[PDB]
Design a protein around this ligand. Structure first.
Ligand SMILES: [Mg+2]
Ligand SMILES: [Mg+2]
Ligand SMILES: [Mg+2]
Ligand SMILES: [Mg+2]
Ligand SMILES: [Mg+2]
Ligand SMILES: [Mg+2]
Ligand SMILES: [Mg+2]
Ligand SMILES: [Mg+2]
Ligand SMILES: [Mg+2]
Ligand SMILES: [Mg+2]
Lengths: 97, 117, 211, 41, 43, 176, 139, 26, 192
RNA sequence: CCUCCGCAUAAGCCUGCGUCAGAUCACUGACAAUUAACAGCCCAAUAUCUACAAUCAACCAACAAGUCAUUAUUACCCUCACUGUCAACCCAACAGGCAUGCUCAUAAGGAAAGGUUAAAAAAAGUAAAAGGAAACAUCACCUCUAGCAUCACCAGUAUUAGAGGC
RNA sequence: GCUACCUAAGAACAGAUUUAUAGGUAGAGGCGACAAACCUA
RNA sequence: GCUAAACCUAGCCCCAAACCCACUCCACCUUACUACCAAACCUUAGCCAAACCAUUUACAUAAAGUAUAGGCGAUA
């Protein structure tokens, strides 16, 4: 059917462990540190999208203009494909016109 | 309409069977009348020595001890072979030591190799 | 299949060569298929001397009753229907000899005070000695089964039971465990169940003839 | 998903248990159940 | 209908490796199968 | 003498052939070259005995009397071959020093990949070799997209294995 | 002489001898009835018929007279759990008919338990008059 | 194969009620 | 064997293993806890003690060690009692067959203190790697013949250093012995 | 009682009703097979002859105008290697085809009736009185273009080559 | 590689015949006794 | 009651970093998986959107989506 059969694995999760303990510690970095470095650098994440959060089409546009010459050919053709798709997607057919 | 098998003997027509063969080495030549002449020159020649009186049996007894795996290092073997000749000669032109300019005249040359297995 | 030889012959006919795998691990069994010497009931101090070399602390007369208590535990092993202390109590040669017919049935048997006291008779000897006690106690047994019908064994009145129950002690860290139970050819007949069971004749097929 | 539709047998048993006195194949399955039970209420 | 009346000589002709490698587009075909990673890289 | 094509008739039916261990390589390395030839021939005879016995065992559909003996003789013969190869390699290193025993090279083939081709001993010369000149060992620019694609597949397998290993490690540390 | 390139030979080269020929051999019992004066073998995939004569003359000095070659293709109707065509080991077989009236027959090769032996024969089987009652109890 | 920890508990409660209705205890 | 093929206490290639873990299965793997490569702290036959389970505290001996499942077979305890010879009508025979135990589930025994001792595979002047106890200053070593056959070569024969190093080939030395008088040499061809 | 088939080689497939055991109108695993004179696999240079069909080939009788030959000179010695050989076989519908050599029903090969009953409607066959139907190509011809050569036309020359009409 | 048309080089008995085998003509095409037909359901 | 259900965990996901792949012996461009005689570059095209169709049209942050250009009609 569509249910489980027994009670599932017991969710051993310590909500108070170290790798979550400092979650945002030293993360008011800018005005609480005499303006040396903004929070706009403290994020450890991909350089395609580290803090210019536009739309989906914008997301891909930034991915291209940042790292396109660093992809295998499948990713380049893929990013080009969806970029063409989205450029057609924005201004063609929708609810508000 | 089948392809995944190997290309061994049985594939198609007569001559299509005729050319290829399994893993032999050729022995002769094809001359007139579709007659093959195979020379004793190009044939395999397996001349083993006489086995009588060699005391080394095919298996080795387990009562013997073990040793260390001493690979035949080229510098080590070269030193062990050339040490006495060089020691006497320096106490006394590598042709006396047997250095080979070319192996063009030897039966068993090395580069290319003409020996077998 | 009939035995190992029949399986091997039908294996050769089936072509299934059982490949010999070389393994150092074996079975460290601690039971004996039989006993070293069975004392036939109606000079054996060499076995006692050989046993004292390993244990060095053994009183024969006090060895019986606790073993009888262990034998009583065997009755408890049926009365509690608890194979746990059974496997913790007796030999593996006795576990099939005490359970494979005993299972899938109800037994509420018990022992009571001896008609005749048990006497130690046997002594024996990869080392496992065997000591037997001849006991005539009171028994209260009943064969209840899947139907729940208590079928073989009187209801409440105990009966005199004499037999040469032989336990065995191997030589590691264990102690005496129940080996077997000697019954002489001069033993009295048993009381069977009240059910009548047919012994089928030699079943002739439609082709042959009946003698 | 980041969340799939997990409460089905509870939902269907909430559906069919107010019409379990019918006849025919509609004693069982959710589509027949909804149609007849809706009519009945 | 019995259209597929194949023959081994013509098979290794029209589907072999030498002919499939004679013009560089076929070399590209070989490479396309290779990055596709099949087994029957030719016929 | 065909009598050696079967094993010793005395040991037949004994369910096991009491044979020693294989000759140690360095221990075998102390024997003469003529002795090496003797050892190789004795190994050939025993190995033939092994092959005939095993095939007959299949023909009789029964177990093997000395199953480890065949592979042991094979292993000892392989060790003797290793010693022979070591001596021939010492000869090739001393006398000329070329690395791969056959003369050959690294080049590129019509599939565009980098490989090492082997030259073959053949009579006629490379300025007239009617077959070797047919060997199209040239690649024009039409191999680019496929070559980089091959790089892409290699990288995909690489990142796949790395992710699998490190995530398996993370689950492993979670188990402690 | 398998698994190696033999040396190139010209019109008048030296006799290309061997040192330790790797081409092992296996001669089995005949399967169908055969004449007496020939013994066959499952030679490996490489050597020639005259090579078989030479290898026999080296190993045992047999009087080789006739030599025979037949290429038994391995079968290809047997599948694995992935359901693929997996051809068997194909084999080329050979036969040397030996001379001087010798005729070699196939050798007729290949011509804890006691505890179970004290158990299986010592079953002490259930009596019909017992009727399923357990015999561990003696009463 | 719903990754979740509650609807299981709901179905377990229903099945336990079913077990109680299967044969009521003494 | 197969990728992530589950090994067991039976032989690593057994037919009974193929009736246990056949090649056609892709089963669920077990989580193997990785110990250090020089730190397989069990030796075949050594006395140890099970710190857990029924009959814990006794002394046993680990005989079988399949490092793949990373479990220890300490015979003497930790056994089930199962019938063997399950034939059509044969009564069978009950045997106490013993299963594995985990490396963290048992502790090695101190050879002098007679206690469950966790030891470190440390270094010594005589021995580069050896298990060394912390509760006591003792090193635990690993604990523990051939009649010559008709095809068995003796050690006396095996003591001959007959490989006198020459500058000639093995084929060359043999032909020097064999007397194969060489008339022609090879002709020089190219490398096409 | 059937056999306008059958037996072979050819092609083409790939061990596919051989043997010992399992149980899946009542296939699976292991073991064994096909030992060449037939057929392929070839042919040491440079030049030089090679009009006189075949049809039983002697006549007649032709047109569509012929499907097969060395020789000269130089150089050259050593012999039996390798690979196909099986089979109830191949392409398709879920009616059919298969090139070639022999036997024109035969020496080889094969079985349309699972068992019964004897309905109609249908299908096939037998029997029935009395009557006996109640356009494209093309030969021929015409027209038009083209005065000529080394990859077609053509190795040709306006009685030629190509294109339209009836 | 079926079929359409052609080449090479064979076969059967009476041509505008069929066919064993290789080879050639690729779609913006070829082929076409032109059926506005074919060239892999 | 049977068929059935259900179960984790294989490994995939994206990123971070980092430049990687190519010789057991062998054989492998002829009919690829057989030991052997006398030749390469020459502009991508096209729709779509113009509510049909034609010129036109893509295959770090900030100035700035302003200056340039549009059957001056769509936008880039
Ligand atoms: Mg042959
Ligand atoms: Mg011939
Ligand atoms: Mg045949
Ligand atoms: Mg007949
Ligand atoms: Mg029939
Ligand atoms: Mg009928
Ligand atoms: Mg009429
Ligand atoms: Mg009439
Ligand atoms: Mg064609
Ligand atoms: Mg428009």
């Amino acid at each position: 059917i569509g249910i489980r059969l027994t009670l599932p694995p017991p969710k051993v999760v310590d909500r108070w462990n170290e790798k979550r303990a400092m979650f945002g510690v030293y993360d008011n970095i800018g005005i609480l540190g005499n303006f040396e470095k903004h929070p706009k650098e403290l994020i450890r994440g991909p350089i395609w999208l580290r803090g210019w959060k536009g739309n989906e089409l914008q997301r891909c546009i930034r991915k291209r203009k940042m790292v396109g010459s660093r992809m295998f050919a499948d990713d380049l053709h893929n990013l080009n494909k969806r970029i063409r798709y989205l450029y057609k997607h924005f201004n063609r057919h929708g609810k508000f016109r | 309409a089948d392809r995944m098998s190997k290309w061994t003997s049985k594939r198609g027509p007569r001559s299509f069977r005729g050319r290829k063969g399994r893993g032999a080495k050729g022995i002769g030549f094809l001359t007139s009348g579709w007659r093959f002449v195979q020379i004793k020159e190009m044939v395999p020649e397996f001349v083993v020595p006489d086995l009588t009186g060699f005391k080394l049996k095919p298996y080795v007894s387990y009562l013997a001890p073990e040793s260390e795996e001493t690979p035949l290092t080229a510098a080590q073997l070269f030193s062990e072979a050339v040490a006495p000749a060089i020691e006497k000669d320096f106490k006394d032109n590598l042709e006396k030591y047997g250095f080979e300019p070319t192996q063009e005249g030897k039966l068993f040359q090395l580069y290319p190799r003409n020996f077998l297995r | 299949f009939k035995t190992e030889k029949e399986f091997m012959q039908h294996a050769r006919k089936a072509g299934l060569v059982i490949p010999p795998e070389k393994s150092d691990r074996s079975i460290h069994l601690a039971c004996t298929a039989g006993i070293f010497d069975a004392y036939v009931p109606p000079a054996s101090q060499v076995s006692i001397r050989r046993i004292k070399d390993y244990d060095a602390n053994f009183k024969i007369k006090d060895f019986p009753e606790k073993a009888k208590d262990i034998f009583i535990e065997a009755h408890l092993c049926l009365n509690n229907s608890d194979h746990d202390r059974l496997h913790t109590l007796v030999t593996e040669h006795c576990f099939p000899d005490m359970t494979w017919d005993i299972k899938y049935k109800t037994v509420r048997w018990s022992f009571v005070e001896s008609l005749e006291p048990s006497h130690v008779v046997q002594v024996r000897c990869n080392v496992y000695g065997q000591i037997t006690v001849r006991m005539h106690t009171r028994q209260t047994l009943a064969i209840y089964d899947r139907f729940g019908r208590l079928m073989y064994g009187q209801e409440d009145v105990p009966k005199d039971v004499l037999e040469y129950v032989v336990f065995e002690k191997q030589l590691p860290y264990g102690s005496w465990r129940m080996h077997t139970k000697i019954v002489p050819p001069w033993a009295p007949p048993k009381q069977p169940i009240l059910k009548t069971v047919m012994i089928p004749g030699p079943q002739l097929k439609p082709e042959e003839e009946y003698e | 998903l980041r969340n799939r539709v997990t409460d089905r047998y509870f939902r269907i048993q909430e559906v069919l248990k107010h019409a379990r006195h019918f006849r025919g194949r509609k004693n069982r399955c959710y589509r027949l159940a909804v149609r007849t039970v809706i009519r009945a209420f | 209908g019995n259209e597929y009346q194949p023959s081994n000589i013509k098979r290794k002709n029209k589907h072999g490796w030498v002919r499939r490698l004679s013009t560089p587009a076929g070399v590209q075909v070989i490479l396309r199968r290779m990055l596709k990673g099949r087994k029957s890289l030719s016929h | 003498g065909l009598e050696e094509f079967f094993d010793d008739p005395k040991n037949w039916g004994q369910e096991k052939v009491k044979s020693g261990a294989a000759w140690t390589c360095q221990q075998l390395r102390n024997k003469s070259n003529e002795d090496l030839h003797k050892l190789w021939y004795v190994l050939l005879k025993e190995r033939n005995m092994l092959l005939t016995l095993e095939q007959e065992a299949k023909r009789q559909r029964l177990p093997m009397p000395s199953p480890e003996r065949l592979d042991k003789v094979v292993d000892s013969m392989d060790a003797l071959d290793k010693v022979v190869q070591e001596r021939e390699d010492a000869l090739r290193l001393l006398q000329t020093g070329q690395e791969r025993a056959r003369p050959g090279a690294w080049r590129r083939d019509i599939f565009g990949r980098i490989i090492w081709h082997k030259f073959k001993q053949w009579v006629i010369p490379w300025h007239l070799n009617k077959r070797y000149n047919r060997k199209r060992f040239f690649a024009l620019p039409y191999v680019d997209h496929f070559l980089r694609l091959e790089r892409e597949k290699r990288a995909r397998i690489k990142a796949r294995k790395e992710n699998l290993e490190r995530k398996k490690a993370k689950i492993l540390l979670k188990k402690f | 002489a398998r698994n190696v390139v033999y040396p190139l030979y010209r019109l008048g080269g030296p006799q290309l001898r061997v040192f330790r020929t790797n081409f092992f051999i296996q001669l089995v019992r005949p399967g169908v009835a055969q004449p007496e004066d020939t013994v066959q073998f499952r030679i490996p995939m490489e050597m020639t018929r005259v090579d078989l004569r030479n290898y026999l003359e080296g190993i045992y000095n047999v009087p080789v007279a006739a030599v025979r070659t037949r290429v038994q293709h391995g079968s290809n109707k047997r599948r694995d759990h992935r359901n693929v065509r997996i051809k068997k080991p194909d084999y080329k077989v050979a036969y040397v008919q030996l001379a001087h009236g010798q005729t070699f027959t196939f050798p007729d090769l290949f011509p804890l338990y006691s505890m179970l032996e004290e158990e299986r024969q010592q079953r002490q089987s259930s009596d019909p008059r017992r009727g399923g009652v357990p015999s561990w109890f003696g009463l | 194969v719903k990754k979740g920890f509650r609807a299981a508990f709901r179905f377990q409660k229903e099945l336990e009620r079913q077990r109680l209705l299967r044969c009521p205890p003494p | 064997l197969p990728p992530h093929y589950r090994y067991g206490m039976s032989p690593p290639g057994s037919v009974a293993d193929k009736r246990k873990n056949p090649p056609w299965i892709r089963r669920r793997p077990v989580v193997v806890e990785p110990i250090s490569d020089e730190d397989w702290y069990l030796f075949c036959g050594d006395t140890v003690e099970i710190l857990e389970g029924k009959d814990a505290g006794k002394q046993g001996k680990v005989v079988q060690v399949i490092r793949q499942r990373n479990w220890v077979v300490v015979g003497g305890l930790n056994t089930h009692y199962r019938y063997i010879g399950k034939t059509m009508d044969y009564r069978g025979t009950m045997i106490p067959s013993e299963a594995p135990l985990l490396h963290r589930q048992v502790k090695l025994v101190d050879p002098m203190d007679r206690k469950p001792t966790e030891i470190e595979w440390r270094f010594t002047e005589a021995g580069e790697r050896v298990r060394v106890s912390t509760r006591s200053g003792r090193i635990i070593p690993k604990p523990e013949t051939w009649i010559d056959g008709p095809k068995d070569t003796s050690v006396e024969d095996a003591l001959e250093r007959t490989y006198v190093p020459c500058l000639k080939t093995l084929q060359e030395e043999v032909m020097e012995a064999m007397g194969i008088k060489e008339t022609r040499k090879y002709k020089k061809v190219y490398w096409y």
